[PDB]
Design a protein around this ligand. Structure first.
Ligand SMILES: *C(=O)[C@@H](Cc1ccccc1)C(=O)O
Length: 408
C-alpha cells in the first residue's frame, strides 16, 4: 500500500520559556495539565500552544499523535538546542552523495505529504525515457544496488525532501552538496532545471558506473593518506579530519589497503565498483560534457559552495560546462566547503536525505564551534516512521529559531 493517506494525527507541540530553566518546568506543567483534563484534544492544545503563548528564547518541542504520547514525551523532554539567537539564524541544506540510499526511503512521506508525492511523481515521469523504468519501483519496491535507478532514487528523494521543507517555509539561505548532492544543490539553487537535469544525471551515472575501478573510504586525515598514493590512485574526497576517500584502478586500491592495514589505518572498500573523482574517468569526460551542453545553466539564486574549490561557487563557475566536468573528475573538497559555509553564515545545518553522513563530517570539521545540526530522514535500519522523523526535524528547527518551521 503506497496509496495516499494524507497527514495523520501527528502534531508538534511547542514550548518556550525565558530560562534554561523554566523551560523544563513548563514542559512538566503542560504534561500534568494534559493527563488531568480528559476533555483536551491534541487538536486544541497544539493550536493553543501557538496562538496563546509567546514564542520565547528557550524552546523545545514534542511530537505526538495522541495526548498520552505527548504527556510521556513532555516528561522526558530536555532542551536540545541553545536559546534562539537575537537575529533569526541562517539555514543551510546539506545534500549527501551516494552511499545511504535504500529501498523504501521516504515511502512514509510519499503516503503522507502531497508535495513529496507530487515531486516524486513528476520526477518519475520525466525520467522514464532516460531510465527505461518507473523510478518509483526502484524507490519503494526493488532495485539493483549501485544501478542507475538506485542512484537516481537518491537524487529524487533529496529533491522531493528539499521541496517538502521549502513548502513548509523552511527555505535555505545556503546549500552544499557532496558529490551527487551537488546536482541537487544546483537544482534547488536555480543553476539547473530539475527537468533537464534528471536525464543528464542519469546518463552521467551510467558513464561513471561503466568506467570500472574501485573506491576505498579511509578513516584518517588526508595528510596521513596522501604519502601512500600512488600511481593509479586519486584522492577522491577530503571529507573531515578523520574521513577521506581514495579511488583508482582496482589493483592500486588493493595495494593501498595492504599498506593501510600494515599501518593500522582503518578503511572500508565502498560497495560500488566505480572510481568517481579519479583519473579512471578521463575516457568519458568529453562525452559527458556533451550531455552537460544540453543544460540551460544560470547563476545561482541561492548561494552554494562547490566541492571543486571548497568555496562559494561563482556565477562563472556555476554556468561553465568545464567546471561541472571538473566537479566529476576532481577531489570532492567537502571539509573545506563546510568550513567556508560555516564561516560566513554560521547556519543551522540541515541534512536533506537519508541518514547523517554529512552531519558527522560537519561535527568533526566544525569542532568545537558548536554547530546546530538537524537530520531529516532515517537510516535504512531505523524503526521510526518517516513522518515522525520529519516532525522532529521541524520542531527542532523551530526550537533553534526558524519560526516558519513549525507546521500549521
Ligand atoms: C558521488 O556522489 C558520486 C557517486 C557515484 C555515482 C556513480 C558511480 C560511483 C559513484 C558521483 O555522483 O560523482
Amino acid at each position: 500500500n503506497l496509496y495516499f493517506q494524507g497527514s495523520g494525527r501527528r502534531l508538534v507541540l511547542p514550548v518556550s520559556a525565558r530560562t534554561s530553566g523554566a523551560l523544563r518546568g513548563q514542559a512538566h506543567a503542560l504534561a500534568r495539565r494534559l493527563e488531568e483534563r480528559p476533555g483536551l484534544r491534541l487538536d486544541d492544545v497544539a493550536g493553543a500552544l501557538r496562538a496563546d503563548r509567546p514564542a520565547l528564547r528557550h524552546r523545545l518541542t514534542v511530537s505526538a499523535s495522541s495526548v498520552p504520547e505527548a504527556v510521556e514525551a513532555l516528561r522526558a523532554a530536555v532542551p536540545a538546542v541553545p536559546p534562539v539567537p537575537d537575529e533569526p539564524p541562517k539555514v543551510a541544506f546539506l545534500l549527501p552523495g551516494g552511499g545511504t540510499q535504500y529501498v523504501g526511503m521516504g515511502s512514509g512521506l510519499y503516503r503522507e505529504n502531497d508535495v513529496y508525492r507530487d515531486t516524486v511523481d513528476r520526477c518519475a515521469a520525466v525520467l522514464r525515457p532516460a531510465l527505461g523504468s518507473d523510478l518509483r519501483t526502484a524507490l519503494f519496491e526493488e532495485v539493483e544496488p549501485g544501478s542507475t535507478a538506485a542512484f537516481m532514487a537518491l537524487f529524487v528523494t533529496e529533491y522531493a525532501l528539499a521541496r517538502t521543507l521549502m513548502e513548509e517555509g523552511v527555505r535555505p539561505d545556503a546549500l552544499i552538496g557532496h558529490s551527487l548532492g551537488e546536482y541537487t544543490a544546483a537544482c534547488l539553487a536555480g543553476v539547473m532545471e530539475i527537468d533537464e537535469a534528471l536525464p543528464v544525471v542519469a546518463e552521467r551515472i551510467r558513464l561513471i558506473a561503466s568506467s570500472g575501478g574501485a573506491t576505498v573510504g579511509v578513516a584518517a586525515c588526508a595528510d596521513t593518506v596522501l604519502p601512500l598514493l600512488g600511481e593509479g590512485l586519486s584522492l577522491a574526497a577530503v571529507n573531515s579530519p578523520v574521513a577521506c576517500t581514495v579511488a583508482g584502478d582496482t589493483d592500486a586500491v588493493d595495494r593501498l589497503e595492504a599498506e593501510l592495514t600494515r599501518r593500522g589505518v582503518p578503511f572500508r572498500r565502498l560497495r560500488m565498483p566505480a572510481a568517481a573523482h579519479s583519473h579512471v574517468l578521463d575516457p568519458i569526460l568529453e562525452s559527458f560534457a556533451g550531455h552537460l551542453r544540453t543544460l540551460t545553466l544560470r547563476p545561482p539564486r541561492i548561494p552554494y559552495v562547490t566541492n571543486v574549490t571548497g568555496d562559494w561557487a561563482t556565477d562563472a563557475q556555476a554556468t561553465d560546462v568545464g567546471h561541472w566536468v571538473d566537479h566529476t573528475r576532481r577531489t570532492v573538497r567537502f571539509a573545506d566547503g563546510i568550513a567556508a559555509l560555516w564561516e560566513r553564515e554560521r547556519p543551522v545545518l540541515v541534512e536533506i536525505g537519508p541518514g547523517d553522513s554529512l552531519t558527522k563530517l560537519a561535527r568533526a570539521r566544525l569542532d568545537g564551534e558548536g554547530p546546530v545540526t538537524v537530520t531529516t530522514m532515517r537510516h535504512a535500519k531505523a524503526q521510526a516512521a518517516d513522518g515522525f522523523v520529519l516532525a522532529e526535524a521541524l520542531g527542532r528547527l523551530w526550537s533553534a529559531g526558524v519560526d516558519a518551521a513549525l507546521p500549521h
